[PDB]
Symmetry: D2
Subunit: 470 residues, 4 copies
């Protein structure tokens, strides 16, 4: 079976209980709700449909709420008509949202546009189709010189590479959506356009105010500012979503693949989930099979070491959602099959030298004894994520009494969570883990299993490794 | 400077001496002539233009002739009009080339169509857009059942995965083109649609009949048959071109990226050049910059270990040839920069244990002494290709008296060839190599260089490694 | 503190309770009783004296009974006088024990002498001083030609290298001595002149028949036959004593140091205790300090990897017994100090080796001063010791015999405990006793090794705790 | 064939040409002349006899001159009679060489005795048999308290461990003996009782002043002061002789074996020859075979990595000189056989070490029986030997002094050649001589190491050839 996990964005074609059951059969592990669209009734109904399928089938899945976030965009044009911009011309942006634009000027949604920019900065419009350079800033207007020919339409994205943008983390709509997430008991929140660590902290404080302290925050890295502040963002987050397509608008095109590899590697070292997203199998919105290029790009993200890959439009609004999940699962299985363990220590936190020494040792022992299974006891999921860091060949069966942890571990590479009533002692954990190893069908009589847990320590440390024959 | 080499297909927009000089400045190393188009006068003029630029500037480059090759294609339709094929319908192919097709039947160019196929085989038309299954074969007709809906146009490619096709290696036009290559003294021949080792042997015998015995044959792997026979094809060839897009028509889409990685790895182990080709920066035929996906795919082929990457339409007929070469060179430099040496022995030929032990040792010694340069003496190029196998950080300065070898080494990763008058002894090689190391500007006073050669042995063995301070 | 263990042969000068207490303070770990001499009353009194000291002081030690065994020796000469043998002369051995010898003939103690020998075999007399070659065998006489000049005295050792000797494993005296060992509850039996596997099995069956099935057998390798059959002897034994001096009589002198190194390495690999013995500090029988050569020889046996070193006459009858133990302990501590772990890796014991090797590797990566093992039969403690950990091994057991036997294993500190009811209870108790032992302090890492939900004989669990 | 080299001290029983030829056949590589005894006529005749044998047979050997050096000794007693010293008594040393000693006072040979000592220092007499402590120093007398009982005889060694002795490096006799060494063109000088770096420099300057600048200096480490200054002594020397017996008198006995191991390892790392000496096979002065202990001690010094082992009285005056060399060669061959290469890696010599280490690694990956080196001063041959190659080193040189000196280096077979005009000529000639040597045959791989377009002192080229 595959180890890499699949996040599927759910929309009208895939929201039914029948479709969700088939999505899970095809390899879906996590349902993404994109709050860029839909009202609370639709999203609530999607949550309920998945939970009904989970209850009926006994399958497990996680729910991830994805925030709309905040960006800069152009606004309206005369008669809604495109205007042709000529390289070398003057063109002006204004913060006055009432102004209707034309070939000479257009309004933007961000009032700080004049504050954050400076003469000489470069302004990008419509996913970097049109580049301009600021030549003057006066009152509510940013005067620019156009660099390349291009056609301007309405409501196009604006990108400011090399500039810090003082946009708040959460709009009012994002705050209400987060409260909805806490009321619904979602497992993850993915935050769009995370630019700096204070953005993550301000989401964390909102969730803690509404009973979501146990919800994991996945920061979406989508622009140059987020990439520059990656290390502080990761430290403050529970995980990362690499949004390759958005990032490629703002950084040099030859850097994008190295930004992805660097972010994935740091997430693995931090024992924090990483999702690779955007431009995965987009061609399958319209086509029943993907391109060679798409399949290769996905497989290379898996070889980079991603925990999970994500479908967006392919599953939300596309014509071939089940085909997209099936082929994605096929790529996952084909690629996972040829990956090896990474038994280097990679330990940077002295406070976790014990956990890392024991978990690394447990994977090395599993591999030398051909153990098909590592059984972990976990309360918060740390021990399972600490084992996964070394990319074991063995499947990780994670036993927990914490329902939230069981759901969240669905996103971690090669982890099979199992909710259990209780574990009263180390010896009881061995007894139960051997029974459930056999019941899971992931191991059989005579197989070696390695069992990992914390003994006479509180949650957050793993200090014990034990080898059993089933 | 980059190490990965760039093959550029030259066409009307890039054939002038002025353009060729700018192509070389931008990072072009090898000129590809695609004999699918153009007459002998055009190709002869392109060869002469490059050689004039080489003589005037003293820059070096190689010339690669790419054969049209042999394939199966459909033919004409009624009124030249597309017909819509419906899944589950009957559809017939005929070998009678005079028949004009319609929604029920079409002719194919291959007379062996009825011989090589069998009931139950799958037939693919137009880069696998329409799939069919053979239901009967009678006389000159292959009767099929259509599997998916699709529109059929005229002159579309036919693919027969899981079938061996008895097509000759060379058409009559290919034979004349090869003779032209020998008369022009081209450095490489790239052979399209190589299916088995006998195809390579039959090209080798044609070249040896026209004074082209020293021309290197690059086999193009473009279909399932060539991939299945890869090992025998490589053994008979001097190098490989991985044509990813063509291969993806016939094998499962999740296998393509592993076919590429496997072929590249085997070429490296065999000390034979490998080119990664097709679907590289195709978007730049129309756009002045490539996509994130394209840049990532190219970089991953370099991290796989390709000697060279190839531009096709981007340089031959596209609107932004110099932009395409520039960004390709930028991706090469960015990616080469972070690759490490591969100091594993990987020696499978007992007849070359000495060459591999000395060359591997020389790279290890270069890396431990921070030598920026490995100077190799070579007659046929083997010693330079044997050093390159270990991906040295150092540049390889390859000294030779053989003009053909000097040109061919332009395609090998990280090799800078230099034609010299003579080398009369090992000590004379050290004297000259130190002078030329300094003259090349690749090393300076006080730098360590490692110098590799064959002493008291004939061509084809490398047995000596020597460490000098400039 | 040293890790290598010291075996001391106890005799008249070292048998008092006062002396035994000082021997233990000086570094004695195991008492050897040499049953070549002394009666049951003397040996019983030495056992009683040591157990009194152990009870009074709470110090621990092991008791090893060393059998006399059987050998071939010449017998009496006319008027007790030496005779000079001339190279090239005829000389005859007879099995008739009544014959009084002379320059032409002497009797031997072994009746099978005529049976086991053949024309052309080599006979060695008096630690190989006189060599001869068999030229004929007739009735009860082995007729020989003398090879080198020498003087023959009375009661000299006879060696037949390259010949198998059909001497029983145990003489009747050895059988009675082993029964005494069982009566006394000794921890080890060292069997002299082990020649082959059947010898070990005969001892194992004899001990089992007299309630000594838990007594460990240390096979003494002293001759060429024992060395040739080493692999099967080790497999049947619980440990080995390398008797270098005796072995040097029968094999080429340049081979002796490699026989020692080979036997030690194989004992380590088998997780079986090995003692290096004979010619250790012999000069200290008469001198208050040893020679340079003796100190180097002892240190090299430790660097070879021996669990223990052994004093013979130096401690049993010598004039400087306490000095000999003190300098031996000093050599042990100086040499143990600079030795490193050996972390290189029976399909039946792949689990035990994987866990114990991993435990030592983890201990060293975390600078753990202590590995705490739970053990019933001592296997788990011996499995950890195989990798020469820097850390001390605190071995917790409820088995009194095991606690004593682990005294001989390198770097092992045994501690008898009332019980261990669960894996978590083992961690609780092991951390308490780690602190109580003074071998580790608050904040130190300890690695704790045990068998969970498996019977004795397998070690499957490793756990890391901060004290 | 063995790789470890054998130094033999030549005396009356081994000085004849007939004996020397048999010594070389038995495995002697280097002749030691001990200038503690004998006059220039005797030593000159031994040199002449060896060079005659070398000329007649074509065998090669090196000549090492060993200086007497300077030490402190007691002097005469009244009537030549021993006196018994009682622990706790007063006992006085005087620098007045005319005083005849008794149970209360004795003279010493060293006039600086009162200068170098201080109240509280320790004085050792007769190989440390009698210890004393300085209680006062007045004029020409050092007043002491005796620590242990002992009998004092005449002319006994005095040791002052933990004190620096201001004895000159060379006595006047040593200076004349070194001039003799220069006259005779000896290959090595071994300097007794080297205490510090200035001693080595004084010898180096003395040899340079008498045409001996090409003579290699082997510093003898025999006491505590020399051992403390070892690093600077090695740096100034061409090699080291580890005199274990003498060193055992002044440092704690458990340290001697580690001083040996440390000095050998540092000599290897410095690419400088090391000799292990004293207490090697001493029992063979009287016996036709050595002891188990002696054989093991010699083998462990070889496993430590010594270039050479040395016979003293065993070859100079003993009753079994040929037997001693034969068994020593047997130990060498048996021990060298099982040793492995050490392929682990001065910024000025990074190139030489990278090429020579690589050459040994390549030789072993291709099963090359032979590494052929071109050398002027011997550095390149010694640089390859540092990695303990399995292959024999055939060292081609035009320097006669170098050819002789390489006889002392482990596993090196030197061969004098007329000339080497180029790198390609070196390969041509080396392949011919590889075949002629009988050390390699048609189809064998050889690795050939040399300096190309660099002066002496750097090795930069490695080349692989099939014979």
């Amino acid at each position: 079976m595959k180890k890499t996990k699949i996040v599927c964005t759910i929309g009208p074609k895939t929201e039914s209980e029948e479709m969700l059951a088939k999505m899970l059969d095809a390899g879906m592990n996590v349902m993404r709700l994109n709050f860029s669209h839909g009202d609370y009734a639709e999203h609530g109904q999607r949550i309920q449909n998945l939970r009904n399928v989970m209850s009926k089938t006994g399958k497990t899945a996680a729910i991830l709420l994805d925030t709309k976030g905040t960006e800069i965009r152009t606004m309206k044009l005369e008669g809604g008509n495109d205007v042709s911009l000529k390289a070398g011309q003057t063109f002006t942006f204004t913060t006055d949202k009432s102004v209707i634009g034309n070939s000479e000027m257009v309004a933007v949604t961000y009032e700080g546009f004049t504050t954050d920019l400076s003469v000489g900065n470069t302004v990008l419009v419509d996913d970097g189709l049109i580049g301009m350079e600021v030549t003057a800033i006066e009152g509510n207007k940013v005067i620019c010189k156009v660099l390349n020919n291009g056609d301007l339409g309405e409501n196009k994205g604006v990108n400011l590479p090399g500039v810090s943008i003082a946009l708040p983390a959460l709009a009012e709509k994002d705050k209400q959506d987060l409260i909805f997430g806490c009321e619904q008991g979602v497992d993850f929140v993915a935050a769009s356009f995370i630019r700096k660590r204070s953005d993550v902290i301000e989401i964390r404080e909102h969730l803690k105010a509404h009973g979501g302290e146990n919800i994991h925050i996945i920061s979406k890295i989508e622009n140059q500012e987020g990439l520059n502040n990656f290390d502080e963002i990761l430290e403050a987050s529970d995980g990362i979503m690499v949004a390759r397509g958005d990032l490629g608008v703002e950084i040099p095109v030859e850097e994008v693949i190295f930004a992805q590899k660097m972010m994935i590697e740091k997430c693995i070292r931090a024992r924090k989930v990483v999702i690779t997203a955007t431009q995965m199998l987009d061609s399958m919105i319209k086509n029943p099979r993907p391109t060679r290029a798409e399949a290769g790009d996905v497989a290379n993200a898996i070889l980079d070491g991603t925990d999970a890959v994500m479908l967006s439009g392919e599953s939300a609004k596309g014509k071939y959602p089940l085909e997209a999940v099936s082929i994605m699962a096929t790529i996952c299985e084909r690629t996972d099959r040829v990956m090896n363990s990474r038994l280097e220590f990679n330990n940077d936190n002295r406070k976790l030298r014990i956990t890392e020494a024991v978990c690394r040792g447990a994977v090395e022992t599993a591999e030398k004894l051909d153990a098909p299974l590592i059984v972990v006891a976990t309360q918060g999921g740390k021990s399972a994520r600490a084992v996964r860091k070394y990319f074991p060949d063995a499947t990780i069966l994670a036993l927990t009494t914490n329902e939230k942890t069981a759901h969240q571990l669905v996103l971690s590479k090669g982890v099979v969570p199992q909710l259990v009533k209780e574990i009263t002692s180390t010896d009881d954990f061995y007894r139960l883990g051997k029974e459930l190893a056999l019941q899971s069908g992931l191991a059989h009589k005579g197989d070696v299993v390695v069992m990992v847990s914390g003994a006479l320590v509180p949650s957050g440390t793993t200090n014990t490794a034990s080898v059993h024959v089933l």
